[PDB]
């Protein structure tokens, strides 16, 4: 119901903006499956290693699965600033 | 001459480990394929706006070239902690 | 023409949700205003200092221009991502 | 007992900065009550939800509690910056 | 085995840079101290503080802790941020 | 005349707080001396660089000013978290 317009900042986006937007969305897909392939892999990295004290000690002293949220966090808020570049709300 | 393990942190990395640091690499440069793409745009929106006052105004206020800096930054940011998250060094 | 459908992520908002993102951007005007007032402070307190080599040699150690600039952006991007708690957009 | 005399930095600031100052905090609180009213949203929305399983995980997809925390920090961080903007404290 | 000529954007590192680089490292090692300290200091607040509830209240109102974290990760991230100026890696 | 009392969110601070902080901004200066060390690395590099084109396009290319900026907003933006850690004021 023509929802977008009762959103303060709306403006109007031709195809070539809208395409734009779905590209990074699209490149964001592969990031999404690229940061699930190494989750699946510190996971199995975690459990080969179990009962070896010295290598559990090891990746919890790297803390992996912190670097890899704080990684996602910046890839999807780079995504929404890049948006944002193309969408161009005339709001702060 | 090895120099990586003259640097603080070094742990040596599998092939796997190097694989997946690599497709980082490499979905990264998409996104900075994109980004060129979407600066390109924003250039070409800004000349043929050229003695549209209200529009270079609406241009100047949405600030697209500082939102695409900020989602570039984001990015490569991003981009340096899944690294991070497989590389694992043992270095703060 | 119902140009949000087009792109990917979109959600059905209900009115409630819709007010809850407008209040955000309200609220973030007024930062917005509190920015322009701190920002012409700044200009003024650069002014009434000139020929006073000790003064704007603090100022300039203090970089008041750049924190600010700092502030902005993070008070934009904190907008956004409460607007994105809000739409839960189903993209990544 | 004059503690802030004794904090590396400190500066002595006229009315009109402290004013900015408090008005920065004032501002934020208003934030603050924001960001607790969505909070409360989400916790009715999930609760609303409950046994819609499809409704569940869409609800866990878009990972609204994060967005919200995501933008509580970057508010805070940006009234920091704001502020340091006013105070001008002479360290790095 | 040269893992790192391996892996994109490597480049041949001065002596130079690489104790440059170890010199960062060291500093956050001294950070990584500093960051552990402050720690214990917020454990034995909060124990010390055991039995009183407006205490108890007043920590959980400054989340210390949560502070503390996005301190250290600013601290690490920005480590990094220094590291590549110095290491200068040929890849975006 | 106890200016920080005029401000919300003042708490009184200990002895032992007061010097946490000021360790904190005593090593964020070492860091500062860090920074321009690498700076006028940087400035040197570019010009015995100088008429090598293929080397001046390859520091544009890693653009390292830019990362020793985030880099040195990154350790500002710590410094601060860590320090509020320590100083727990009452307001958001
Ligand atoms: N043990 C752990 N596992 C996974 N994520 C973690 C973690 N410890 C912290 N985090 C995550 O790291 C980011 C900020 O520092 C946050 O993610 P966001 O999403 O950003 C924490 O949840
Ligand atoms: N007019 C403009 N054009 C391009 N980039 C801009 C700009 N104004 C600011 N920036 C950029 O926005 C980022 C942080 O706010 C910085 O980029 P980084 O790289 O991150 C500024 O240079
Ligand atoms: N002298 C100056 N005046 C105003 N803004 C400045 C500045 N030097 C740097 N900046 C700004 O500080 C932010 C990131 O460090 C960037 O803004 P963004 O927008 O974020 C710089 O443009
Ligand atoms: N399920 C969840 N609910 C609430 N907050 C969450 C969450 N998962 C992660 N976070 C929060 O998101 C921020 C960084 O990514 C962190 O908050 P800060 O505060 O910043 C996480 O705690
Ligand atoms: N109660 C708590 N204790 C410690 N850390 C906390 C916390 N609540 C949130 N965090 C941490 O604050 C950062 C982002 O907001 C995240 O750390 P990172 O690492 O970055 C959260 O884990
Ligand atoms: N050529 C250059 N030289 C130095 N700093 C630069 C630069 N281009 C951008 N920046 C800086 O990078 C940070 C955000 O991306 C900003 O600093 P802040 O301070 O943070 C830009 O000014």
Known sequence: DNQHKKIKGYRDLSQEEIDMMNRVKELGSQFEKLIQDVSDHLRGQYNASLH??????????????????????????GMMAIIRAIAQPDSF
Chains 1, 2, 3, 4, 5, 6 share one sequence.
């Open 52 to 77: 070896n004290r010295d290598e559990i000690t090891r990746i919890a002293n790297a803390e992996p699965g912190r670097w890899l949220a704080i990684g996602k966090t910046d890839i999807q808020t």
